[PDB]
Design a binder for this molecule. Sequence first.
Ligand code: CL
Ligand code: MN
Ligand code: ZN
Ligand code: ZN
Length: 453
Amino acid sequence: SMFLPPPECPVFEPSWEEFADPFAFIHKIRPIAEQTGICKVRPPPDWQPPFACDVDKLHFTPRIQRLNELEAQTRVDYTLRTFGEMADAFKSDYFNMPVHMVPTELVEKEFWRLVSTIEEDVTVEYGADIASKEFGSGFPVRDIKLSPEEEEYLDSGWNLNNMPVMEQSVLAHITADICGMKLPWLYVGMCFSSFCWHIEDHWSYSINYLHWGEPKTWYGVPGYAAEQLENVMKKLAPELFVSQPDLLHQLVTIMNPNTLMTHEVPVYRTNQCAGEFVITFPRAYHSGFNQGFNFAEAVNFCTVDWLPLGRQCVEHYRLLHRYCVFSHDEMICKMASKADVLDVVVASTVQKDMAIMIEDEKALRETVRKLGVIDSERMDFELLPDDERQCVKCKTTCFMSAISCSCKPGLLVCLHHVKELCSCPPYKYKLRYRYTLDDLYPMMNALKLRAES
Ligand SMILES: [Cl-]
Ligand SMILES: [Mn+2]
Ligand SMILES: [Zn+2]
Ligand SMILES: [Zn+2]
């Protein structure tokens, strides 16, 4: 009747020993948590990173949010004090209650009532921005003089500034600019402010820490059910699935988990409270809303487990004509070029992906040669701005190779779309390539040597 809450997602309480290495721990829980898409992690009781900031000197510009189920939203001045004041009064006036007295069950039930009710037009506000000098990480960072307590947490793997640049992560090695993806984002919530159903770019992981305040309610769907969910959503809201001109135009929406559950899409929930982590796994759809005034911090990351999925994601982007945040192949080759300093399990896993890359590239080059492309020239793709090396047809970011024609200066197609560049015969085309196959096999060999050492 009305709202039936989804079953709870897994909750882990690691020992200090398990907690010592976040990537080992994530690998450990993966068999369980990937079945549910999201999971919650409670740190050991004494892991307590100090939060300190001036509520009057932290400023941000809030985003306005209408709360209508199935309505399209785009994916991407208050002080913290004045926002908090607004947020508390909003919740307090909404329920005619003190905020700590409003049961989380009630806020959840009411959220799903108000987004589905046409006659209600509740609007709320929220903050979402990357860490900057005007608004920095909630975790300790080096800058000016820090307390010993802050020093304790400076190097923690669970300090979300460090997570991107550890010895078992992959996004670290990327030299290309992916700031929107590798830097933590800060989120200031209020009652009912929400995040629409989405998956992370390049099907990466994400990890979210609620620094303080009232809980954040989550819904998650396991990666295996991603296409099921999309099919449900495309039937109910086809507008969200029209082609989009860039990454700054991704359309997303609020949708009741019971609707998914009715269509046999598995959905899990949780209330993330202050001091708790939520982890989302590759291609796991998630959404949620805040219970009240709060402050969270989140970052994307990629494990070695993720590498094959990363490759599959870019393939999927190609099929959908979606823009890439970075070139997956460029990242693989960057790591190969640093094989000697790579962690050994990383080296072994990159070697396997590189082997697929090379064999695919071989087949593509044979195919375009048979189409009559004969001329070729080496090209350092990584030097081109992204918007100068996207395939005309499928928008993929080129790196291994592309086709050009003097007919249309500056334009490129990837080797899947040789026929989509221009009307000139293929003998007028050039194969532009980053590496010969003969360059590539020794690169892969270096990884092998590092891996077997
Ligand atoms: Cl509404
Ligand atoms: Mn997310
Ligand atoms: Zn293409
Ligand atoms: Zn041409």
